Amino acid sequence: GSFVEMVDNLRGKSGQGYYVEMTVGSPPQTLNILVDTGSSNFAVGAAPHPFLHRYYQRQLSSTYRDLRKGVYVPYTQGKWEGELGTDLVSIPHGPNVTVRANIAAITESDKFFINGSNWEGILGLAYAEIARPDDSLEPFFDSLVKQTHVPNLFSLQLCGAGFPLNQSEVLASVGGSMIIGGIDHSLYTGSLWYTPIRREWYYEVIIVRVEINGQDLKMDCKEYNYDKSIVDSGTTNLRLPKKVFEAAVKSIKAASSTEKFPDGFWLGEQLVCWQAGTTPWNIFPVISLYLMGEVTNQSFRITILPQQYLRPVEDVATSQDDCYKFAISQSSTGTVMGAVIMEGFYVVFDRARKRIGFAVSACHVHDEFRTAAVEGPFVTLDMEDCGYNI
Ligand SMILES: CCCN(CCC)C(=O)c1cc(C)cc(C(=O)N[C@@H](Cc2cc(F)cc(F)c2)[C@H](O)[C@H]2C[C@@H](OCC)CCN2)c1
DSSP: OOOTTTTTOEEEETTTEEEEEEEETTTTEEEEEEEETTOOOEEEEOSOOTTOSOOOOGGGOTTOEEEEEEEEEEOSSOEEEEEEEEEEEEOTTSOSOEEEEEEEEEEEEESOSOTTOOOOEEEEOSOGGGOSSOTTSOOHHHHHHHHSOOOSOEEEEEOOOSSOOOHHHHHHSOOEEEEETSOOGGGEEEEEEEEEOOSBTTBBOOEEEEEETTEEOOOOGGGGGSSOEEEOTTOOSEEEEHHHHHHHHHHHHHHTTTSOOOHHHHTTOSOEEESTTOOOGGGSOOEEEEEEOSSTTEEEEEEEOHHHHEEEEOOTTOOSOEEEEEOEEEESSOEEEOHHHHTTEEEEEETTTTEEEEEEETTOOOOSSOOOEEEEEEEOOOGGGGSOOO
16 A cells, blocks of 8 residues: 555545645635536535534635636536635645635535535546536646646545444544545455446546346346446445336345335335344345456456445434344436445546446455455457447
8 A cells, every 4th residue: 555644634524525635825714625527617605504513714815816716516416606716725634735716605505515524625536528517627636737737546445334424423534535646546346346446527438238146137228328327426426327227126126025115215215124244145136247358359347336326324213223224225317326336346446548447345345154346357349339329
């Protein structure tokens, strides 16, 4: 592991997001910032909000520059409105550099901030194409690379605890690592396998095959990427296109049929509980997603366990049962490989080589009988046809 200063710099959990400490302005104002590979705007609360105990105070920064322009950013979940400007930004547990970056000062928001998440802003790590108002607003990572010698690559190790973290525990617990400019080998086991970034907007990838316990879901692979497939740390769940979700749920139900779960569970809205330590992991299937490889006609697969797709939640009675929510849900905007999937792997966003790497995470949750996996190669033909074209 060669990036010790950045190892263990994240906090949070899948249900509320993973965040990194950043500083903005002069003198530096410390803020916790949501790591979001599914958007491209750097934005921080800049006005009082019931869920914020701190916010960016522009009038206290000698390096603040007003762009005299408003900005509106709508996400699937919620939205915010703000005022554009630039200021000096640093990451305390990151690369020892300070850069001048665009910052949207959030003045109004709806369903954006999360009560108790401990974060006050968002770091959109995707490409300028999807930046608001338009692609001329340079994203933070682009500025970082242009202004310093930091390699055009970052990697994420999101660490799910495998159990509920109460308010105090989640504040004192290490939630993972964001390695800026490199790959830290202590964070994964086995080999890194790379899939091409199909196009530089979201971190778009192509899924070529899906298995539930080794059984082919057997759908036209274009359905898996309808209308796109993305890697998104800013979404909790694995979200699947309607038809794929329906097929996957039918197959996961069939594999786990020795126990019947209520419809509310499969809808991802209701928790299920087991007596302490008795969660029947073995009745739930593993899920394998095959991704386009970098070699012609070659693919590889990433395999996740129910310890990834069943999200630990506190029992509404706070008892001693082990409880979970089903973290796979339906999408109308393509596949979203969210945080619960990322928790099984060390994910390398190799922007310089236009590829995303996956390796088994050194912090993934598993049992004595099964482990997450990244395996290859597999002969796979006509993978280009798996991509969707509007
Ligand atoms: C992560 C904590 C729990 N959480 C948010 C609160 C329930 C989710 O799991 C979640 C669920 C859905 C269905 C969408 C998004 C979502 O829109 N996430 C965005 C980031 C985000 C927004 C927000 F407003 C609160 C928050 F924390 C995180 C991504 O940028 C997402 C936006 C999407 O916008 C398309 C218009 C494109 C893909 N990436 C996030």
